[PDB]
Design a protein around this ligand. Structure first.
Ligand SMILES: CC1(C)CC([C@@H](Nc2ccc(-n3cnc(C(F)(F)F)c3)nc2)c2ccc(C(=O)NCCC(=O)O)cc2)C1
Length: 423
């Protein structure tokens, strides 16, 4: 039947958005309620969820307005459609920042953490404690003799130093120190079990302290290292503040304790970038959705602007989206070589967060952007393409599923608090 087909697809679409909405609100509720989940990654997700929830709201509003001059002629419809188009470009751009965040998350490592903490020197300097340092955090000897420090550096660099050392030579010695730091952990009976129980990020947190103090020194934190292995992050955090290390160099300590406490790079994460992401996810939409809304109100106003087929004015919401998809696929491309390397190199297990996120993210990029890309310059078997409307509807649900319900972290939060109820 013709009428029966058109009605059944409508059912699946609305229950798609009903289930989507419900699930995404529950998920955002979870990310917001549990304190441990308060990190930049999940904040980006909450923005993404918002874009999907708001899209859902538009769907439900349009539907309620069917209930009693017609609705297609009204201006309130054209407004709800502009809100929905904004959400759609917000979906695709919070996905672009979801892609960018993932890329940089793969690009930040210990080498970028220690370049931030330790600084860079070109010439040899006599530090406060008495050690001559140069390069990135490379202490030479405490022996109070600049002549002998320059020589001690010359054997450690090969050619004659003179005092000034080039950027490439410093990066070479920096690599040397970091290999030495990880070997020092693994050659340490108290640091290896905890290091092998830590995830890559908290691993880099441990490496950092070794780079500053040394293997035999951070081993001293017996009180803290035990509760780090027992996965009790917050109880160790307050314990590491009560340290000599925290009172000696506190700005460095706070960053590293936060990295133990959270498991993210957020304490090495400039506060202005999260801005520029909330700006690109929500802002740049506003940079091509509203001038569309104008040419559509001015030059193409016909039945809530659905009869969108005349002239260039279709392109200017499809090209910016098209452009995001292109990159999101370039990103999609580059990322995978990244992950193949990092898993081949054993640099990145499958238990880690950068990988878990590429699982999610790299799924959604094509599942969202692929259709966009195929029919790249098409403007417009009929019961077949109807099924695209079932995918989009459930899109919202899928995100929640992928970005909260199957996410390991939140499941640990649930079990942890039921246990707090029993005890
Ligand atoms: C509808 C589906 C069947 C498709 C979806 C599926 N997508 C997906 C799965 C795997 C790869 N993949 C593997 N290797 C590479 C490579 F090449 F190395 F990069 C990529 N790519 C894409 C998926 C399944 C499982 C998860 C998952 O457990 N999430 C929890 C992780 C977390 O959030 O904490 C996520 C996504 C689910």
């Amino acid at each position: 039947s013709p009428e029966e087909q058109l009605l059944f697809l409508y059912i699946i679409y609305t229950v798609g958005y009903a289930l989507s909405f419900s699930a995404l609100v529950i998920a955002s509720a979870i990310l917001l309620g549990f304190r441990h989940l308060h990190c930049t990654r999940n904040y980006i997700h909450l923005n993404l969820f918002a874009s999907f929830i708001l899209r859902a709201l538009s769907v439900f509003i349009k539907d309620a307005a069917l209930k009693w001059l017609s609705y297609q002629d009204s201006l309130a419809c054209r407004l709800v459609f502009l809100l929905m188009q904004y959400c759609v470009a917000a979906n695709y751009y919070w996905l672009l920042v979801e892609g960018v965040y993932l890329y940089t998350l793969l690009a930040f490592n210990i080498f970028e953490m220690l370049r931030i903490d330790e600084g860079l020197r070109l010439k040899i300097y006599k530090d406060t404690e008495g050690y001559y340092t140069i390069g990135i955090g490379h202490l030479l000897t405490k022996s109070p003799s600049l002549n002998a420090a320059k020589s001690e550096l010359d054997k450690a660099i090969g050619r004659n130093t003179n005092g000034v050392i080039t950027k490439d030579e410093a990066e070479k010695l920096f690599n040397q120190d970091v290999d030495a730091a990880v070997r020092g952990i693994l050659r340490n009976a108290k640091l290896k079990p905890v290091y092998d129980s830590l995830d890559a990020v908290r691993r880099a947190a441990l490496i950092n302290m070794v780079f500053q103090m040394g293997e035999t020194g951070v081993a001293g934190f017996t009180n803290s290292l035990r509760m780090l292995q027992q996965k009790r992050w917050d109880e160790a955090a307050v314990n590491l503040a009560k340290s000599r290390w925290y009172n000696q160099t506190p700005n460095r300590a706070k960053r590293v304790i936060t990295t133990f406490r959270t498991g993210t790079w957020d304490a090495y994460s400039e506060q202005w970038i999260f801005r520029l992401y909330v700006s690109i996810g929500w802002g740049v939409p506003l940079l091509f959705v509203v001038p569309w809304g104008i040419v559509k109100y001015l030059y193409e106003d016909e039945g809530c602007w659905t009869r969108n087929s005349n002239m260039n004015y279709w392109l200017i919401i499809r090209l910016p989206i098209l452009f995001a998809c292109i990159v999101n696929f370039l990103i999609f491309v580059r990322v995978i070589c990244i992950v193949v390397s990092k898993l081949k190199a054993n640099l990145m297990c499958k238990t880690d967060i950068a990988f878990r996120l590429a699982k999610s993210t790299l799924t959604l990029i094509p599942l969202l952007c692929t259709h966009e890309v195929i029919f790249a310059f098409v403007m417009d078997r009929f019961i077949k393409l109807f099924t695209e409307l079932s995918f989009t509807s459930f899109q919202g649900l899928m995100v929640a599923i992928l970005y909260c319900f199957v996410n390991n972290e939140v499941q640990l939060e649930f079990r942890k608090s039921w246990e707090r109820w029993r005890l």
